[PDB]
Amino acid sequence: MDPSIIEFIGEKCMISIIPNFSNEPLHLIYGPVGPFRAGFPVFVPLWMATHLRKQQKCRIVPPEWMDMDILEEIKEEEKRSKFFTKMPCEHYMVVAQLVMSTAPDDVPRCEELRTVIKDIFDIRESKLRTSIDAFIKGEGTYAKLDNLTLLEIHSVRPILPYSLDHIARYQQRDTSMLS
Amino acid sequence: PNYYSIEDIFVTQEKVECRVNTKLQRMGFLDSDDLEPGRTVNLPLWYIKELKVNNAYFTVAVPDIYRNVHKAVCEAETTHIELGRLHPYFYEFGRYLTPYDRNHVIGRIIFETLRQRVRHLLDISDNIEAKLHEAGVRTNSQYIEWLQMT
Amino acid sequence: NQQDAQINLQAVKKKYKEFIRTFNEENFFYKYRDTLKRNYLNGRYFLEIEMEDLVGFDETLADKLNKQPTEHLEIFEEAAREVADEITAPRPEHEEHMHDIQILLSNPTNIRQLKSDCVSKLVKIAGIIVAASGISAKATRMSIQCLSCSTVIPNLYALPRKCNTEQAGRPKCPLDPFFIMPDKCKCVDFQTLKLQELPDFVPQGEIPRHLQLFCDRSLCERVVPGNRVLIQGIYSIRKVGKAVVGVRAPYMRVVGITVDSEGAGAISRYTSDEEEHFRRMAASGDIYERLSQSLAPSIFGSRDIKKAITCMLFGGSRKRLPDGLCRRGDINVLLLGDPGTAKSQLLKFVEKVPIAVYTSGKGSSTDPQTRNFVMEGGAMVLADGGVVCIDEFDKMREDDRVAIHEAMEQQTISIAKAGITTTLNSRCSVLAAANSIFGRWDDTKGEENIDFMPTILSRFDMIFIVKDIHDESRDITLAKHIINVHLSSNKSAPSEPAEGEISLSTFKKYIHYCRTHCGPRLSEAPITVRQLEVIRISESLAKIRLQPFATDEHVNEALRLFQVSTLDAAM
Amino acid sequence: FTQHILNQEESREPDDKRLSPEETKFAQEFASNVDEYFHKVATQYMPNQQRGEAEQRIVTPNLMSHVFLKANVAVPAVIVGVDDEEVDMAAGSQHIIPYQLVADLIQNNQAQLI
Amino acid sequence: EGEQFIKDIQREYVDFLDDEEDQGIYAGHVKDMIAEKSKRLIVNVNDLKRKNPQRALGLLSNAADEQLAFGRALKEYASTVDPGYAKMHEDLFVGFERHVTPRSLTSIYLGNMVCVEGIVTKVSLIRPKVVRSVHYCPNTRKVMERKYTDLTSFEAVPSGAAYPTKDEDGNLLETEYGLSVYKDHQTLTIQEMPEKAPLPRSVDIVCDDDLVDRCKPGDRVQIVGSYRCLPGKRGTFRTVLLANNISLLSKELDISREDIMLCKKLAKNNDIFELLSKSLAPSIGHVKQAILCLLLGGVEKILPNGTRLRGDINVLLGDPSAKSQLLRYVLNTAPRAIPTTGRGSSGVGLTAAVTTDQETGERRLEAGAMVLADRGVVCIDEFDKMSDIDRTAIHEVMEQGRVTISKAGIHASLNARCSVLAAANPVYGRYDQYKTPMENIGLQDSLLSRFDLLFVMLDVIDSDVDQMISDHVVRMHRYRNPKEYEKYDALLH
Amino acid sequence: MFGEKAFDLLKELERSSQTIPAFDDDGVRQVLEEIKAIFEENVAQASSYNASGDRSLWPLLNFRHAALQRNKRCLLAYLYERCRRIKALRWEFGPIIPGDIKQALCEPEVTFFNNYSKSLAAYMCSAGYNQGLPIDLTNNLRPPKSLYIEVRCMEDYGKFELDDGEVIHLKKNSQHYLPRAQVESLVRQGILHHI
DNA sequence: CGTTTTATTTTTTTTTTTAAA
Ligand SMILES: Nc1ncnc2c1ncn2[C@@H]1O[C@H](COP(=O)(O)OP(=O)(O)OP(=O)(O)O)[C@@H](O)[C@H]1O
Ligand SMILES: Nc1ncnc2c1ncn2[C@@H]1O[C@H](COP(=O)(O)OP(=O)(O)O)[C@@H](O)[C@H]1O
């Protein structure tokens, strides 16, 4: 439960990017990567583009859920989210941070992007105050993950469970109740 | 030896004045070798935390805020009742108390108050709630930088 | 939808809403957007904004906005609701219902500068609050049986000839069968607020002018008199015309005031390092006599006898009993003497050093609107926790000298102008100051300083007299205690360097902890009945040494201070 | 959990799977510091009957860390070991619980954690 | 008959009428055989919400219309059980039992039945208002009828107008009275209880026939009400709260025939003088035995077809400085018995010629201060200094105890059974018999039996009583304290 | 009274919060010298035939137990409470830089201290390698640069730097020809705005 | 064979009257 705990995680994901110099002073780091050639895109984890874009080395354009129309349609797809909805990579609220930090110095339209995603994040979390006004009666055996994303549940992780324990002291005897 | 507590000298030391069925012998701390059936007998808990509740020494009795007279309407008045800091151990008296008085009736009440918090702290965006309250503020205050360096 | 300019919609159509949805820079913090969320931490139903962020977008709305905000701020209302009500649920599955809102704006000006030209216009000025009314009423709509439509209103006529008890065949119903039905209504607040101009803009040869104000919903219960304001309003009207020709309406309303935080006074209405400041000095058991040169922190007097203040400001203890009485936790002390001793300015400072008022005699002391008889009250106003120190007891009318006898020995208060009985009391006290007859030559002899009663010399304690005693040794010193003390007018800062004779504000809150903990007590233990009845100062020292308890005669230190007084009434 | 973990170790001598040695050298380091500092807290007239490493001291018998479950198994209702209701499992959803009841699937690593 | 839930809402109160609470506790033989006929039942919301919580909300958002309904269900119940308590067909209002400061009625609670506590004040004029019109057609002789309404009762009004005539044809048309009934109406206002104040803001209420002035300006109460406001602001607005019950807090008694049985049995302990004398002021030697009758007022005596003799007692005595912290233990506890300022007038019993208040006024501020203690008692200080004008106005009283002044105001006579005390100061100190008793005070002996004693109060500081004074007065000062908070119980001694 | 006195201990850490000049061992002294004095209170009827084991010393036997009870666990705290903030700085440094004072050392606190410093020894043998390396965990995670340039700080204090340097004067401008081998000590105890 | 009715408050100077050590 942290700001960079996810960033120990989410940037592990890997996507096709462009390098604009070829293989480095060494040729290839062994691992899933293949070596590098300018003008030839390469898929990598995303904790190098730090050391490219801040290094003034090469560009990148994103995945396709990272665009306008698909998310300008998911904005109405989640009408079904009386449980949950479509999940484009389930971390588009963390990657977009570091993407839109330094990438959009050259990217088109980093804004409607930003607009909708904030227009999607908290609103999916309003669900998570409201659907909690459905939660009653010691429902340990009722919960919801079915298309939950990655970045949200931490924001309730520390609180209610460390409450619900010394509730759960009460959640055999005679007619009265017991804990 | 405990699910420990900050006030282990105010933890089991809040005091009640239960009456008496039978005689007494030599209280020691008090003005005492024999006293009456039925008396305002000040009783700070701990020695009677396991002192033979079934025995003919003491009776059904409550400090009456903890009696139904407040609380059994504080379950109907469970709507905007305030508690402040008053009788503090009020999520937790019964965690010991409830059967020990042996009026078999008030186990529901405290739960009935505090399970309300499943729909109190939506709008959140005693000496025990303090911890989780601090935490509730804190985690969001740092989720703030979970956005960015901000 | 006349979309050439002045359109009815653009704002709520796309624009101001989208400005809101554009107020967006990264960190994911730069928002005019989550503000109201943390307003919704309670249901505050408002929000604050600027007058120079629209300018960060454009130069076209700034001029268009400020002209007719009577329209724009409700356009903004509609944008607000129709945007924010999206937020109760992402998709249709949470809403009790929506509700109502507020929007709040933010170079100053004055009152003698704004006239016929400055009408229907928004302004920034600054003044000083005076008083204002209560919180009554106002709605937006309701309806009538006769037609049952929500009576749409332009401004916060009276249903002309159409009746609508009408379409029953013929049988008609002219001239208003309109019983207004408030059970269908809405509801708002009011205060009618007020200002006075500065003390800098020529009220001297002229008169200080002022005007009236007008508020709406949540901005009442915010402001009380004796405060200092900046504001934005409107120059608007109430009357009609063409009054030998047309004299008419001043007032303003509010939009978004911004008040002041004047420096260091207002721990009044709206740290632990300071507790470390507090306590490590009291760790030293050197406060009793150290602060006997502090209460007059910069000048001479009461020096070896100032120790007797240690009991009074902390006081004793209002130790109630099982029986009737509520004892005299309030207890009184005296001063008396001639002028020249700095006795005018010393107590002048004492108001600066908890809470009170200070002058003497007839100077505190026994409306044409909405037919209610106001009565602002008596003398416990600023003194019920506050205490006072004043001159001119006998130099005062004897009509307002019964109250003192009721006030003081008991707080035996009552009311009899109209037929109801204020049963008031207080934890208050007084000191007396003096320029009565013949001082030290009087005090040793008998009893005529006050020329009416022997009562006084009744329920008072230490008798410490102010003199200008001839002492040739001290003559030169107080001949030299007085020049540069006056001259350069310079004694401000270097009193605070002392160990514990310092820091008036820190002292204020030292004390307002010190007494303000509980009702501490004493231990087990010429000596007459009244002098005795000082027992309350037996109680004092546990706040002075900050004990729980103490015994009789270590605190008869005060008796060494009081036996000084006993020589006045020795025999 | 220096307190009663030694019960588990004297129950099972937990093998390379469960515990590790250096943890059990903390037993040395624990009793050394605690008793040889206690040697100057109360040892002048130390206890009379409960004199050793005392009876009442425990950190965490609560197996009650109420826990979120990473659904990454059989999307049909694979019903498995837990003392509360276990009906209706699936690869996304969850029936939230405490740790006391599933010491089973994560010893299998059948199930997972969020 | 709005949205047709109305009858169903009526049924839900009628559905209050089935088993042990209704069937055993509630009404029928709970009011009617105790024979009060007063429509008003006590409601207790926690029960109704335990049955029909939706209907516990049915008021709290719209209490405009629960009232014809409640009355309907009641007349159905009382009208389908008792035929005696049924020839009073009117609304027959009921209990309806959020306390906010009269300062915190803030646009809202409209439609809500909510509470505020405060002062009775400006208790005002009483005037009935009219319900129906029992109109007659004396040629055709048909007693026809026309009901009326106001917002102060419901939402609507009729064509509220002149009692009609010449309406049908011009036949014999005239009223009939004694049947066209009327409704006792009262108006007053309330203030916050002043101690909370930092101008404290008031409220305005309106009443009805069984709600009519249960106490007085100079009392205070908890009172529960709805809210409206009728006028049409800018086509200003001003409100009033209403739809009320009554309660009261500043009184004193779970005293049925048990507590009398309690008070009898301990009678026989003969020297209660001991107990009752050491009862209120153990915080004080000395008197308390003697105090007895200033509390008790006195006794009543009437001759057949003649006159009477006044009954109660008046005495006071002392060295300067126990006399101002003494006149207590009854000023607080005694029912409605008031000492006064000490040197006070404009209210002992005079008009005080000051016609700068309402521009007229004959009796407009004619009154005194002992009739508030009618069948009570009084004390004061500063008699030793007080004026001799109304000393005259005493000599009437201690002789008679009825006040009979007519300096053109009016030829008064008004009951009073009151007693009262005085002050002292020795104009020369410690002289009581060496000089003499009398006129070490600056006083008068015309008042021989006016007061009912010549008594004395004395002191000297001593050598022999020196440590006696020390050790007892401090025995007090530390039996003042606990174990002999800030102060627990002081037990021993 | 019977130990209501940790409520007094709370202010012993006041300046010693994150700006700790020095700490104090106090609040304890006769608080300890009572406890076995009142073993006499605890021993008085202890196995005495004054009553031969009957009613009137059961209820306050529990007191004798309660008195014990509150004794030991605050005595857990009295250093355990002190061992926590210790552990922060004591992860912020291995045995490089122990306490600034060691003046409020509850005299055999070294018993726990070294042992606690040596509970890490378990971890240490496994940490770094199977044989182990006292491993960098808390300090100078610069992506490290060349060894020999001087230093700037933000008024560190204690001057306890045991690392191979001539004299650094561990404050802001502890600035001498300082290699990396010296400067590997501390980061966030008043130090590192800057190099 | 139609289309309209209705409110005022504070200060003066005289002749009355009334206040304190
Ligand atoms: N026997 C006693 N019992 C109780 N209190 C006493 C006794 N003797 C003296 N005292 C205390 O001495 C004080 C004497 O001052 P006190 O307030 O009585 O002045 P006073 O008698 O009202 O003065 P004056 O009558 O001149 O106005 C009282 O407050 C009282 O509490
Ligand atoms: N010891 C002193 N220290 C400082 N100022 C003094 C002293 N004695 C007299 N004064 C002067 O006396 C003045 C106040 O005199 P004051 O008490 O008003 O006389 P009175 O009481 O007759 O009005 C102050 O301005 C102050 O300068």
Adjacent-strand bridge partners of E227: E241
Whole-number Å distance, CA E307 to C1' G18? 37
- Ligand found nearest the CA of C474: 2
What tokens appear for C454 in the block? 């022997």
Which residues make Cβ contacts (< 8 Å) with residue E77, sequence separation at least 6? Answer: E14, E17, E27
Q: Find the helix or strand (DSSP H, E) in which E349 lies.
A: strand E349-350
**B47/F3 CB distance under 8 A:** no
Q: Find the helix or strand (DSSP H, E) in which E223 lies.
A: strand E219-228
Which residues make Cβ contacts (< 8 Å) with residue C95, sequence separation at least 6? Answer: C85, C88, C89
Whether C154 CB is under 7 Å from strand G: no
Q: Which nucleotide is nearest to C161 (CA to C1')?
A: G3
**A124/C90 CB distance under 8 A:** yes
Helix axes E53-60, E5-14, angle to 10 degrees: 120
Kindly report the nearest CA distance between residue B83 and chain F, in angstroms: 24
Q: C395 C-alpha to center of ligand 2: Å?
A: 20
State which of E278, E325, E461 you would mutate to test the pocket of ligand 1, scoring each by most atoms of that ligand within 8 A of its C-beta. E325
What tokens appear for C483 in the block? 């020049």
Q: Three-class SS of residue E361?
A: coil
CA distance B144 to C539: 53
Is D89 an 8 Å CB contact of chain A?
A: no
Whole-number Å distance, CA E360 to C1' G11? 15
Whether C399 CB is under 7 Å from strand G: yes
Residue with tokens 């800091």: B85
Is ligand 2 within 6 A of the CB of residue C467? no
Kindly report the nearest CA distance between residue E83 and chain C, in angstroms: 36
Kindly report the nearest CA distance between residue C14 and chain B, in angstroms: 28
Q: In this complex, how many residue pairs, one in chain C and one in chain F, have their CB atoms less than 8 Å apart?
A: 5
**C29/B123 CB distance under 8 A:** no
Q: A117 C-alpha to center of ligand 1: Å?
A: 80
Residue with tokens 């003046």: F103
Asked whether the beta carbons of E125 and E187 are under 8 A apart, the reply is yes
Asked whether the beta carbons of E317 and E456 are under 8 A apart, the reply is yes
User: CA separation (Å) from C514 to C502, E111, F34?
Assistant: 16, 49, 30
Which residues make Cβ contacts (< 8 Å) with residue F55, sequence separation at least 6? Answer: B25
Is D26 an 8 Å CB contact of chain A?
A: no
Residue F13: closest C-alpha in chain C: C276
Q: Give residue E372's identity as a one-letter amino acid code.
A: L
Interface partners of C (3+ CB pairs, < 8 Å)? A, B, E, F
Measure CA C480 to chain center: 41
Tell me the residue ranges of DSSP E strands in chain D. 66-67, 97-98
Measured to protein CB atoms, the chain G nucleotides within 7 Å are 3-5, 9-11, 17-21
Helix axes A161-168, B129-147, angle to 10 degrees: 160
Q: C386 C-alpha to center of ligand 1: Å?
A: 26
Q: How many CB atoms lie within 10 A of CB E206?
A: 17
Which residues make Cβ contacts (< 8 Å) with residue E176, sequence separation at least 6? Answer: E134, E135, E136, E143
Asked whether the beta carbons of C433 and C390 are under 8 A apart, the reply is yes
Q: How far apart are the first and last CA of chain B?
A: 44
Of F73, F100, F74, the closest CA to residue F85 belongs to F100
Is ligand 2 within 6 A of the CB of residue C339? yes
**A132/B95 CB distance under 8 A:** no
CATH of the domain at C301: 3.40.50.300
Decide the pairing of beta strands C143-144 and C180-181.
antiparallel
Q: Give residue E343's identity as a one-letter amino acid code.
A: R
Q: Give residue E105's identity as a one-letter amino acid code.
A: L
Whether C398 CB is under 7 Å from strand G: yes
Indicate the CATH number for domain E257-493.
3.40.50.300
Q: Could you give the maximum distance between any two Cα atoms of chain F, in Å?
A: 81
Measure CA C277 to chain center: 28
Kindly report the nearest CA distance between residue C26 and chain F, in angstroms: 25
Of A170, A27, A49, the closest CA to residue A98 belongs to A49
CA distance E398 to E417: 10
Annotated binding site of C: 327
Adjacent-strand bridge partners of C168: none
User: CA separation (Å) from C524 to C327, C521, C535, D18, E409?
Assistant: 19, 10, 12, 67, 63
What tokens appear for C409 in the block? 């020995």
**DSSP annotation string for F148-181:** ------S---S----SS-S---SSTT--SS--TT
Of B131, B128, D37, the closest CA to residue F80 belongs to D37
Query: HSE on the CB side for B89, CA within 13 Å?
Result: 17
What tokens appear for A76 in the block? 């109405």
Q: Is E25 exposed, middle or buried (0-12, 13-18, 19+ CB in 10 A)?
A: exposed
What tokens appear for B14 in the block? 């809040």
- Ligand found nearest the CA of C467: 2
Technique employed here was cryo-EM
CA distance E154 to E156: 6
Kindly report the nearest CA distance between residue C310 and chain F, in angstroms: 26
Whether E354 CB is under 7 Å from strand G: no
Whole-number Å distance, CA C173 to C1' G5? 17
| DSSP, res E163 | P
Q: Which nucleotide is nearest to C452 (CA to C1')?
A: G21
Measure CA C202 to chain center: 27
User: CA separation (Å) from F115 to D20, F24, F166?
Assistant: 19, 22, 31
Q: Which CATH class is domain A1-66?
A: alpha beta
Q: Which long-range contacts (CB under 8 A, 24 or more apart) does D16-23 make?
A: D22/F122, D22/F123, D22/F125, D22/F126, D23/F122
Q: How many CB atoms lie within 10 A of CB A93?
A: 21
Q: Which long-range contacts (CB under 8 A, 24 or more apart) does C492-499 make?
A: C495/C297, C495/C298, C498/C294, C498/C297, C499/C281, C499/C286, C499/C290
Whether C93 CB is under 7 Å from strand G: no
Q: Find the helix or strand (DSSP H, E) in which E69 lies.
A: helix E67-79
- Ligand found nearest the CA of C480: 2
Best residue of D62, D63, D64, D75 to probe chain A, by most A CBs closer than 10 Å: D64
What tokens appear for A112 in the block? 């409607």
CA distance E103 to A99: 55
Residue C360: domain span: 272-569
Chain C neighbors of F14, CB-CB under 8 A: 272, 276
**D39/F111 CB distance under 8 A:** yes
Of C236, C278, C356, C246, the closest CA to residue C517 belongs to C278
Is ligand 1 within 6 A of the CB of residue C455? yes
Query: HSE on the CB side for E27, CA within 13 Å?
Result: 22
Whole-number Å distance, CA C288 to C1' G15? 68
Is B124 an 8 Å CB contact of chain C?
A: yes
Is B2 an 8 Å CB contact of chain A?
A: no
Is ligand 1 within 6 A of the CB of residue E231? no
Interface partners of A (3+ CB pairs, < 8 Å)? B, C, D
Whole-number Å distance, CA B130 to C1' G8? 64
Which residues make Cβ contacts (< 8 Å) with residue E356, sequence separation at least 6? Answer: none
Indicate the CATH number for domain D60-114.
3.40.5.60
Chain F neighbors of D29, CB-CB under 8 A: 115-116, 118-119, 122
Is C27 an 8 Å CB contact of chain B?
A: yes
State which of C341, C359, C480 you would mutate to test the pocket of ligand 2, scoring each by most atoms of that ligand within 8 A of its C-beta. C341
What tokens appear for A147 in the block? 């298309």
CA distance C487 to B135: 59
CA distance C284 to E259: 60
CA distance C135 to C217: 10
Is ligand 1 within 6 A of the CB of residue E320? yes
Is ligand 1 within 6 A of the CB of residue E323? yes
Alpha carbon nearest to ligand 2 atom 26, residue: C342
Whether C226 CB is under 7 Å from strand G: no
CA distance A155 to A157: 6
State which of E316, E323, E384 you would mutate to test the pocket of ligand 1, scoring each by most atoms of that ligand within 8 A of its C-beta. E323
CA distance B50 to F76: 25
Whether C446 CB is under 7 Å from strand G: no
Which residues make Cβ contacts (< 8 Å) with residue C84, sequence separation at least 6? Answer: C36, C98, C101
Q: Three-class SS of residue B23?
A: coil
